[PDB]
Amino acid sequence: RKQVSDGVAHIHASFNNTIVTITDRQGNALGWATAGGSGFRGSRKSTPFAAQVAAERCADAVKEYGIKNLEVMVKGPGPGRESTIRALNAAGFRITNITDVTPIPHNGCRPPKKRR
Amino acid sequence: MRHYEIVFMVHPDQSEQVPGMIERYTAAITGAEGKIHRLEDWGRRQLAYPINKLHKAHYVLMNVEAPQEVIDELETTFRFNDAVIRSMVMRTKHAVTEASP
Amino acid sequence: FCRFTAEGVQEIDYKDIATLKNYITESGKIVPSRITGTRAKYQRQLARAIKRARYLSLLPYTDRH
Amino acid sequence: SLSTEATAKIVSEFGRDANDTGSTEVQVALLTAQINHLQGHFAEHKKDHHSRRGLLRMVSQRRKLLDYLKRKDVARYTQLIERLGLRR
Amino acid sequence: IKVRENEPFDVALRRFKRSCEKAGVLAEVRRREFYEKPTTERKRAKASAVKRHAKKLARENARRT
Amino acid sequence: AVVKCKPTSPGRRHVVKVVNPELHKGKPFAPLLEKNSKSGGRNNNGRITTRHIGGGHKQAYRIVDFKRNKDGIPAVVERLEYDPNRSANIALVLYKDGERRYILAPKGLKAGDQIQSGVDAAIKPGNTLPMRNIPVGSTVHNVEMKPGKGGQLARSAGTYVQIVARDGAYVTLRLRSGEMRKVEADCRATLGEVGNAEHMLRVLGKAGAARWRGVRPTVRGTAMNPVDHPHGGGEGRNFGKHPVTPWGVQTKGKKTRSNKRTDKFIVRRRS
RNA sequence: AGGAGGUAAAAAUGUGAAAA
RNA sequence: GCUUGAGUCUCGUAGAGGGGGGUAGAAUUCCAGGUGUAGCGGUGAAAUGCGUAGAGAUCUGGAGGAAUACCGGUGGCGAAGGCGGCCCCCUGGACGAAGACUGACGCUCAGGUGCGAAAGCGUGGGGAGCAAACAGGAUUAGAUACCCUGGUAGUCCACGCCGUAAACGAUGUCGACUUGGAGGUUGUGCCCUUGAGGCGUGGCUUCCGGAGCUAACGCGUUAAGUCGACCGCCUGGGGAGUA
């Protein structure tokens, strides 16, 4: 358990699913939970509400590691991405900072031609 | 002869040898009868982003007017010198003077 | 319609990053002429100064490294 | 693109004087020197078609001058082409 | 693209994200470039753009208001 | 360079030979020609241990020193020479002291260029120096695997190697076979790339063209009799078996890599 | 007034003669 | 012979114009290792597919080819096609001002010639991502399609070939003449540069409109208006732009 003091809640959110992972400041993850793992699958899985429940399931078992204050790193858009944020704060942790990092290219790889 | 605005960064450890680098290229400058204008070494300056490593670098400005042939030879050295990092050159624009800082 | 070298004729440099900061956002993105109001001729000169500064690691391409 | 000093050298040899910069004779030679200079450039790269269009242009333009000069003065026509060596 | 709001925040208010590119740039970089519609997409847009200013200029005449 | 002769006669139609006008036409340097006796693939026991070899034209061994031990002595290339044994072209170089030797001709080499060896050589084509001084990401050829061995890697026509990493005592090279192999950093290597890269485009054209090169006809396995090859037999071109060697070793898939002594040098095996 | 987010699974067919 | 035609020279200007050699960041993908783990992923929903071997998720290092967010705008350049990360080397054209120089050297043109998106083909390299054909899962009456998961040629580079597009402002090219308004853009001149201005002058170019023109829609100082020169082309539709 080691009883760490500060961890980083990496929340990789997509237009279809949202993974919640409270890692360590070192990056070595100590636990995670997903919107799909919290029950809701399919349409209900891709909702801001589902994002909120996933936050709590991940917020649990981290107090075991004793993370008091933590950093939040959100990645990519999606139905949640902002609903689970307050749900993570309501969990009872000190939100030190929220750094939004996204894979925004400078016109690199080729995008698909889907969605017709 | 054309004017140039040579500028490059140096590894902090090799920052101690910057005079020698300048003096060597100054020999190249005199070896080309190039009308050197500036020599404003801005010193050990921190970068906007870590270039593979090194948060801090060592900027140096030359801004020298020189013959076409020598400028070709000079840049090849930078690509084969492990001390120098990011060594670009510019065009004439009527030889300049004083620094910005 | 903002003031520039339109009357006080001068030349644009890249070393004056302080002034270059006046034409970029927090993420270091080139601010369009629709906001600056500056002329297109100097806007291109401004953009070249930014890319030169970005290459010399003066002004970051993006925030996080 | 020829050097200004070179163009000054050409005019000082063909026309009546340096002021005859726009004379028919100098116009021919000036275009010729440019072609020979670009001949080496187009010898390689084989892709500067836009630049080549400029070349083919000054070729036809130089061609037109000679045709005019011939009907104008048969003598000077042959006099210019021998000091420049272009007909073959 | 970062917010801290040290001590007195008690709320997100990280609108700076949406103020720059957040999802607007990702909403379109996801697919189909074609290099042909982008031109016509804005030509149809800027067509109405100039016509949007054209509409507002020829208003003063009636309706009793 | 690459030229295709006109179809004057059958067998001369698909003939495409590589011509090189820079090649010195004349008898080679005598002091560097040891006689070489071909064997047609027969060992001490005289049995044909390596089939398909035999005949061909008489060749003389060109003593080319790829060991490159002369250090600090500048040398100008006198001329380039055609080598019947090699795949590329050799270049007759002359050291300042008055000693002529042969070397593999790099891509950028002319009859008048000046190269040298040592730890202070200039980064130029044909120059040989310890890989600890060579800039990463560059391209070199004629590389050694043992310090002072002689040079085994990349010595074929139009071939080279790509130096990638340099972790202290070792250097990771990306061989031309698309494989990453480590090697002692203190090994020497000629900087540049082997010339005559058009040797590949050469098409023999006729059967005899391969014969005088020294290669005897190859007999297909499916044509032999049951006792002569695991294949063959039957009535008309029927296979029915898994492709193997004339000795019974599974071909088309069987990896015969079994050394283990030099395994800790293979970073990323080719694929 | 100015710029951004959200918005539809299936939905086939209809033959050949009438205008002061 | 002259000069208002065309052209040359001197002096500046803006520019994704063309070609070659290097190089930077983001991203994607793969590889190696650590932590850690029951789902991941996709859609309208779902499934195929990856995964207790131990993925996805997350962190460090490295290897790669291609494409260059913002700048960027009915902005500019180019004959057209088409060309936008930056630096350097060679180079084309156009535009504006003040004079000088040649003295109609002009315009156009069958044949002919050069160039010419993409796809496609030949030889040799390269291959991340995207993705014809193709496989499978859905949808469906069936789906040989649209959707999703993978995926080859090809897209990339060097060197050749093919010469076709709704190659289109659907408007041939050159010159002249016939009221304006709001713009953008780049040079040049004068005035108190007192102050982002006041008074003008060319080119390019955007939209709205008078006269006149048209079948009408609309065009409209860059005309489909009014004249002149040369050139290509049309003669009902299908056949067919085939034999």
Side-chain angles (χ1 to χ4, degrees):
Chain A
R1 41 188 59 65
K2 301 77 173 187
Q3 264 57 61
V4 63
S5 60
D6 198 326
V8 189
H10 279 65
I11 303 180
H12 161 56
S14 61
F15 277 117
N16 206 10
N17 207 306
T18 57
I19 178 61
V20 183
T21 304
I22 297 181
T23 65
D24 190 71
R25 184 190 303 176
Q26 301 305 67
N28 304 62
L30 295 177
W32 59 272
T34 321
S38 300
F40 311 110
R41 302 186 307 174
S43 60
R44 53 189 64 277
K45 165 182 55 56
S46 306
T47 60
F49 177 64
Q52 297 172 56
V53 63
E56 299 181 55
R57 288 203 57 188
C58 184
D60 189 2
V62 300
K63 306 174 182 179
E64 181 194 309
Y65 293 113
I67 293 69
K68 308 167 185 176
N69 59 306
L70 77 176
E71 300 92 331
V72 183
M73 187 173 276
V74 296
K75 177 179 300 178
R81 189 202 182 308
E82 199 168 305
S83 60
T84 176
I85 298 179
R86 296 182 299 182
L88 192 60
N89 180 297
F93 299 121
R94 270 298 309 297
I95 304 301
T96 303
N97 61 344
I98 300 180
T99 303
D100 173 56
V101 293
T102 56
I104 301 180
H106 293 46
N107 191 59
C109 57
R110 175 63 178 299
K113 51 71 177 184
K114 68 173 183 178
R115 286 300 92 187
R116 190 211 297 293
Chain B
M1 299 180 176
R2 284 184 176 296
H3 317 304
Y4 298 117
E5 193 177 3
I6 307 176
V7 292
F8 61 98
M9 310 181 293
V10 184
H11 189 66
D13 302 307
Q14 279 51 61
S15 181
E16 301 301 304
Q17 295 76 288
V18 296
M21 296 194 90
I22 294 179
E23 280 147 49
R24 278 193 53 259
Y25 299 130
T26 297
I29 294 182
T30 55
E33 300 78 61
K35 294 179 177 59
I36 180 61
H37 306 299
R38 316 310 304 178
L39 195 63
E40 315 172 309
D41 173 63
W42 295 303
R44 181 191 61 189
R45 184 169 299 176
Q46 182 160 52
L47 301 173
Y49 53 98
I51 303 180
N52 188 56
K53 302 270 66 179
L54 237 55
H55 283 295
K56 296 191 300 179
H58 195 68
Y59 292 109
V60 59
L61 168 58
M62 282 54 68
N63 182 244
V64 60
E65 176 184 356
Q68 316 305 299
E69 54 281 359
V70 69
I71 197 60
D72 308 304
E73 302 143 52
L74 193 64
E75 47 189 55
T76 63
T77 70
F78 295 117
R79 283 185 267 106
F80 296 123
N81 284 177
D82 303 307
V84 58
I85 302 180
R86 300 297 180 61
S87 61
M88 60 169 261
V89 297
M90 294 176 80
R91 267 293 288 288
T92 58
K93 295 183 178 299
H94 288 299
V96 293
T97 180
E98 75 259 352
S100 53
Chain C
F1 207 71
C2 181
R3 284 177 285 185
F4 204 66
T5 59
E7 190 56 59
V9 184
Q10 314 181 309
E11 295 173 58
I12 305 72
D13 199 69
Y14 66 111
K15 290 179 291 298
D16 60 329
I17 53 183
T19 65
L20 272 58
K21 191 68 64 59
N22 304 176
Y23 298 114
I24 56 180
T25 182
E26 186 68 59
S27 57
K29 305 181 64 177
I30 306 178
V31 182
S33 180
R34 56 171 298 176
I35 302 299
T36 63
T38 61
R39 314 308 177 183
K41 192 164 67 67
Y42 309 118
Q43 180 57 57
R44 297 189 299 291
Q45 296 307 69
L46 171 61
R48 190 163 301 100
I50 301 299
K51 284 172 284 295
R52 286 168 174 168
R54 295 183 181 181
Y55 179 56
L56 288 176
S57 183
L58 298 175
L59 304 176
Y61 285 110
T62 310
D63 52 345
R64 291 300 72 184
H65 311 306
Chain D
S1 61
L2 298 175
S3 63
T4 58
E5 283 70 6
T7 64
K9 182 172 60 182
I10 302 179
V11 61
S12 61
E13 192 290 302
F14 291 102
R16 292 278 72 70
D17 62 305
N19 293 300
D20 273 53
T21 178
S23 61
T24 302
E25 304 179 1
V26 182
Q27 291 177 296
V28 182
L30 187 53
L31 295 172
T32 304
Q34 193 61 295
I35 302 179
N36 299 175
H37 179 61
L38 276 57
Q39 195 52 289
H41 177 61
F42 291 111
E44 52 180 55
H45 304 301
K46 288 186 177 62
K47 295 297 296 298
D48 290 304
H49 309 305
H50 294 61
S51 298
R52 183 179 295 293
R53 194 202 182 194
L55 184 66
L56 301 178
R57 174 169 170 293
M58 61 169 70
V59 175
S60 61
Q61 167 171 40
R62 194 189 69 177
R63 176 66 173 184
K64 288 180 172 296
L65 299 176
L66 300 175
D67 303 306
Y68 159 63
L69 192 64
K70 195 165 186 176
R71 70 177 186 62
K72 198 65 184 65
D73 189 63
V74 296
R76 295 182 302 150
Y77 171 67
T78 59
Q79 308 308 302
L80 187 60
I81 60 181
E82 45 183 56
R83 300 162 52 195
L84 193 61
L86 61 79
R87 181 64 62 176
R88 171 178 289 186
Chain E
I1 316 303
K2 170 267 296 184
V3 293
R4 195 154 61 186
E5 302 303 301
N6 295 177
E7 195 170 64
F9 70 118
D10 299 300
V11 64
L13 258 58
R14 43 195 292 289
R15 180 182 177 63
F16 205 70
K17 303 298 178 298
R18 197 195 196 191
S19 67
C20 56
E21 42 180 47
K22 212 249 289 186
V25 62
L26 297 181
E28 61 70 54
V29 68
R30 187 271 297 301
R31 58 183 177 64
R32 304 182 181 185
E33 63 177 302
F34 217 64
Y35 211 70
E36 198 287 347
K37 62 179 181 60
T39 65
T40 183
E41 187 168 302
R42 57 79 160 180
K43 288 189 298 182
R44 166 167 282 123
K46 191 159 290 299
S48 298
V50 182
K51 290 182 295 186
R52 196 175 71 178
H53 190 63
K55 288 184 290 295
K56 294 178 294 182
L57 62 75
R59 48 181 167 61
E60 328 79 53
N61 190 39
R63 295 189 179 184
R64 176 63 69 178
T65 178
Chain F
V2 181
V3 297
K4 185 174 183 177
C5 300
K6 302 184 66 61
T8 59
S9 60
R12 187 60 176 181
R13 171 166 292 148
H14 309 299
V15 180
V16 180
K17 80 181 77 67
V18 53
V19 296
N20 201 305
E22 190 276 316
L23 299 178
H24 161 57
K25 308 176 303 303
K27 315 305 176 181
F29 196 57
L32 299 175
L33 269 59
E34 183 186 309
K35 84 89 171 187
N36 179 57
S37 178
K38 49 187 59 181
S39 60
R42 294 178 175 57
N43 64 304
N44 299 306
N45 299 307
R47 303 192 181 187
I48 178 178
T49 172
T50 305
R51 36 188 289 182
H52 300 163
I53 301 180
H57 193 296
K58 176 182 298 182
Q59 305 173 300
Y61 188 69
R62 262 66 175 183
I63 304 179
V64 58
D65 185 63
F66 25 91
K67 182 173 298 300
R68 203 73 75 75
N69 58 356
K70 300 290 294 184
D71 318 304
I73 309 81
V76 58
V77 182
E78 300 308 72
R79 56 186 176 183
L80 280 72
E81 184 74 57
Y82 175 69
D83 196 302
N85 303 302
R86 295 296 173 298
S87 62
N89 306 105
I90 56 180
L92 179 59
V93 63
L94 169 58
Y95 276 111
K96 186 62 61 179
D97 47 59
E99 194 194 314
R100 283 174 290 295
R101 301 191 303 178
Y102 283 122
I103 64 175
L104 289 69
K107 197 60 180 180
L109 185 69
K110 307 302 174 298
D113 290 14
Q114 174 170 291
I115 64 176
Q116 69 176 304
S117 181
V119 189
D120 59 359
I123 296 66
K124 234 180 181 181
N127 300 63
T128 304
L129 60 115
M131 302 186 284
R132 57 183 181 181
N133 308 65
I134 303 179
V136 299
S138 62
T139 301
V140 297
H141 57 300
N142 186 61
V143 185
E144 305 179 301
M145 290 193 269
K146 303 295 187 305
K149 182 66 179 302
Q152 294 62 55
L153 309 180
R155 45 183 291 174
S156 180
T159 309
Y160 49 99
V161 63
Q162 248 174 295
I163 177 179
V164 185
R166 179 165 54 184
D167 47 30
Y170 283 126
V171 177
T172 308
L173 303 174
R174 173 176 293 182
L175 298 177
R176 191 62 196 300
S177 63
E179 187 276 308
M180 296 289 266
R181 165 187 172 62
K182 284 198 298 296
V183 62
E184 168 56 58
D186 297 318
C187 293
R188 289 179 174 175
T190 62
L191 198 166
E193 75 174 305
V194 185
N196 191 59
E198 50 269 60
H199 173 61
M200 165 186 75
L201 301 175
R202 171 181 290 179
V203 52
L204 294 177
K206 58 182 177 182
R211 183 61 79 72
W212 55 45
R213 280 195 171 301
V215 183
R216 288 165 47 61
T218 293
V219 179
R220 290 175 297 100
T222 182
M224 307 178 169
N225 288 297
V227 296
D228 313 304
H229 197 294
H231 300 172
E235 297 176 290
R237 306 160 184 173
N238 48 61
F239 211 57
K241 303 301 302 304
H242 307 302
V244 294
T245 62
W247 300 282
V249 181
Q250 176 67 57
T251 184
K252 276 186 169 57
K254 201 67 179 300
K255 302 184 181 304
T256 62
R257 181 60 169 64
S258 299
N259 191 61
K260 296 190 301 179
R261 185 173 64 68
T262 61
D263 269 54
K264 60 173 56 62
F265 294 125
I266 304 300
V267 183
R268 186 173 181 176
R269 195 78 184 302
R270 69 181 184 65
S271 179

